[model samples]
Target: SALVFPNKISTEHQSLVLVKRLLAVSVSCITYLRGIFPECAYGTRYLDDLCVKILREDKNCPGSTQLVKWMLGCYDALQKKYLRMVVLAVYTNPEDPQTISECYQFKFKYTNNGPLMDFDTKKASILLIRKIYILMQNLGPLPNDVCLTMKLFYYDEVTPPDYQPPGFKDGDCEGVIFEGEPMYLNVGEVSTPFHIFKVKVTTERERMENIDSTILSPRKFSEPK
Candidate 1:
């Protein structure tokens, strides 16, 4: 089979590829979400519907991938702030105010990118604390009482699960994180199997439409039904 790059592709042409990537990604997301919702939903076949709406119906979210990334950054910031509270509850030391402050500081640095998934517990915990502080500030001033309440009732610290592997560079079977993992050949290994799950929910004309609401609100959790 003959393989070829597009003839004389310019930087501008290469740049446009990001848009196509975003479109394809959004299409996949729509398909995944459509499956999660009820069968009688309006956006039942969302992949097809979104394609029709965007490509054939109306070009609504048309833009460069860079712009879409920026918009996603805005949404990501919201998620980071909210998610950090849960993280603080789970990871930060309750006794030390300095530890709590340090955690919040790191989160402020990395907000609006993505959820912190550092394998290192120390690093992740720091970021989580910082993010929660950001969330607390943005929501409202955290009263001393509320802060104390979190330290006593909300903080849920647990030791991180270790992902230790076998053998070391010294060929010793002492503690190591990636010991028994199979080594991939530079040219012979095929590919890693990675699955991406995307969820989409569309409200009927009467269902609801709050795109920017926190689903995991704490007051909502503590609220009596």
Candidate 2:
């Protein structure tokens, strides 16, 4: 049997082969979503259905490609942000409360991007916080080297959560007193404690590699319920 090697082919031929491979297959919404957002059920469900309707049913679905492109773009920005935070922790004092607070100052605004961003600010905040957590887990140094916190800002009329959120149950909170309409509401805070878990930089690199490999490879398309 003769072994075919990619290096033996021309660059243009290689690209044509890749393109043909992509066009010959279907992409599953679930697989794509899972590749992008693994183990996080926050917004994948809604996005999954929307993706199927757009990519699976109509190749020319209006605004669908734009929506997906926006999400992928957001994730790219977020991935960079996460990398910065991890790098900062490595150089600065990761244990310092002030450093953590400084990181939170870069909080993002959730703009309405069709059905995806239709949820309230609190939910939006939750989604961002969750991504930060994932980023830290994937790319940060040892768990003990850094501790992360979220500050909840609630409207004057709204009551704060009596208990912390699921993963953040053991975290502390600061109460805010205010008047008039609130631009953002404080639902509750979640914290990732220092030294609770073990992590390594090399492992993080490998995890990111897995994500990239899945994204670049062409495969069957299906939706996960």
Candidate 3:
């Protein structure tokens, strides 16, 4: 639990751990609900009194091991506040990564004016995460052949010129704007003593399949009689 329980420094780093761990588990929740990978890819864990499924390091699914690795890799930029957004992009086309069908854009930012001083950002994060998860569940299903990948959206204004998180690519761009008909769920600012941030999930229209009836038509008789 030492690694998972990352409450070391009493000041900024403590709060940073609170922030990153929340974001990590949040992404895992999306992965869990969408069935991006099989059941073996995740393990159930409790975060702040809330039960959630998060990706774990398991040989059974290399996808999960790599995913957890990448999420944790963002800790540096995240702690520096240069990492502004985390996206879970869903795709329909198998040939290209650019052919995304829809996405969950988690635009994350925070402001902490003073020391944490016995505050609990973890609890706040869990409550907000659960609320957001509920809203996502109410939405319709994604494509049956959907693919999943995580993308990074950074706030480069204050970022170091040479900064690059692990697995970062120079060609990485912002979450693509939906061509049209995008739906937005804005859960506005959630404030705590050490962190204040908002969450938004944008989606595209779902395509439902068709059903046919056997020669079913309204009868045309009555008038003649």
Candidate 4:
């Protein structure tokens, strides 16, 4: 059975074994999809849905190896379905998944449907994408077929040194270049539920002043009680 996101805490201090494993799948799938769809790609939306399902169904349920397997299976279908939707929206004519669009020059851009960028991918989906990158350290390289798509996602994680966006150095970020992830491969089969990966989130040669501030962080904390 498909696992959903956990909204509440488990009865036991010990979370269900399956919960942890499902989280692994969620992280893995997000990373995998972000590589394929980058900015316009809508991975976060799918991830949010997956999480909701998990939480609603088993807030206190610990994840297991089996749950991880189920997550991957769902991810596989999600990607294929998304691709189909994109194709349909873009072509207006419902093109085949193997063809490239004249406007985008991207193969599989249209899937026998009319042309449009509006597919099922949503805003919440980005949460999953970022999660994937942060957890990316321990996971092996993604499968080759989706490498190009994955590269697109990594493009944001690591930008070109010389590249400059509009407004140059005036926004939240300056003009500094970013070096992205190095290439690698997945070590084990998808069938192995016990397989696990680790990733760390921190700055590299980046600012160290505000080490513990979040995007919504305010100045000093006041007594709330």
Candidate 5:
């Protein structure tokens, strides 16, 4: 096998490698910045040239365990080429988990590998990087007493997402939308030869109703004094 560009990534083990890395990076950074999770739970790490937070899989931090499997199953979905979108929902109040106070959504479209060693993926990188840059500039002080949920949306196709383990409940989205329209804060899209996609994040400041200060109780995992 040649070193550069490789070959058909569909049927093979080779999926969109950098795309997955970027996906993980984006999620971790967003959580850290928006205060979805806390700062102490995240240690520092680097992906290639990009620095990001690593929510180390822990027996106590169950969400980190869920997230690791989240990405693993996502890789399978890419292989199936059937996943249409992913939503990371930030429920403003863990007590009331019916509505999404804010959410990050990524849409996917994968075209089987085909291109020279000349595919310009830098454009896609720039788009993703800049999307977060803009977000960082405008992000409000998000709440701490919140819960996060991940929902995978698959499009109509001859294939299935979970067909390839983290088996998902095949029910409707179930009252996950905002009570109303949110401010269209940021939306970015990119298309390379092998992959094409967009990520959009929206929020409604008014719905940030639960403002009670919630530092994790007992502080078992991360204790920074």
Candidate 6:
């Protein structure tokens, strides 16, 4: 009976689940680390490889426990270092136009990193510093943490005036105009008041005089084709 049922099999299954979750977290962290710092080499190898190395270093450690430790110990550590590097890069030569341009570009990349946490709040604070850097350049240096207010606004649809057609009345037009037919607005029978411009028909003689006479000339019957 002792051999038939292994003790702590349930605990082993739970550990297996933890291992799967740990592996997932490990992959996620590796992706961010690589995404954030592709250029920098950690010990002559890819940062992703360094992540793998850290996880593998403690072979006997529980996968879940070790991975959580790695996130705090390894990834967080490197993230802080990179933040400091970017901040210093921006702050050191805030006066230089090129430096300011680079600073803007750097801030864009730094904020794009995964998510913001208290430990990860450095970029936002650094951004404030960058604002200060510009303000100092424009209006002389000011005190640290001085309140900087920025007004944010956005453009929305600029709707044009609703166009009303000539002789348009609140009530519906009885019918739509047909092609090649005259449009008559019989305002005398209308219930609502509306404006209308009368288009006068010219006298028959005046209309006939403007016609190209050649079009009316009967074509001589073509001799038997």
Compared with the true structure, all predictions reach lDDT values of 0.22, 0.25, 0.60, 0.26, 0.60, 0.21
lDDT of 5 at 179: 48
What TM-score does each of the candidates earn? Answer: 0.18, 0.19, 0.73, 0.22, 0.71, 0.14
lDDT of 5 at 11: 31
lDDT tens readout by residue for model 2, 25-140: 11122222223212331122222112121132233443333333323322332322211111111112544443321121222222122212112222432343334344433332
Q: TM-score for model 6? A: 0.14
Local lDDT at 95 for model 4: 28
**What is the C-alpha lDDT profile of model 3 across 1-225, one tens digit per residue?**
111433333456566666666667667777776667778877787654567786778887756776676676467667778777766667777656566766765665666664333334444565667776766664566667765566766667777656667766544444354534776767434444455455667666453122245342110000000
- The candidate, 1 or 5, that scores higher on TM-score is 5
lDDT of candidate 6?
0.21
Worst 10 residues of 6 by lDDT: 188-197
Candidate 3 has its poorest 10 consecutive residues by lDDT at: 216-225
Q: After superposition, how far is residue 195 of candidate 3 from its true place, in Å?
A: 3.4
Give per-residue CA lDDT, model 1, range 37-147, as digits (tens).
122321222221122111122234232222233323223322222211111111123443222211110011212232234232223222322332333222221213211
- Residue 7's lDDT in candidate 6: 17
Model 5: ten consecutive residues of lowest lDDT: 216-225
Candidate 2 residue 107 C-alpha distance from true site, Å: 7.0
Candidate of highest TM-score: 3
Superior by lDDT: candidate 5 or candidate 6: 5
Return the TM-score for candidate 2, rounded to 2 decimals.
0.19
Better of 2 and 6 by lDDT: 2
- Estimate the lDDT of model 5: 0.60
Put the candidates in TM-score order, highest first: 3, 5, 4, 2, 1, 6
Candidate 3: count of backbone clashes, pairs at least 3 residues apart or interchain: 0
lDDT of 4 by residue, 1-225 (tens): 433343333332112232233434443454333232233222132344343222222324232232333334323322332211000001112223222111111011112232132231122223333444443433333323321111001122233433322212212311122233322222211111222112222222222124336563331100000
Clashing pairs in 2: 26-221, 27-221, 28-221, 28-222, 144-195, 153-185, 153-186, 154-186
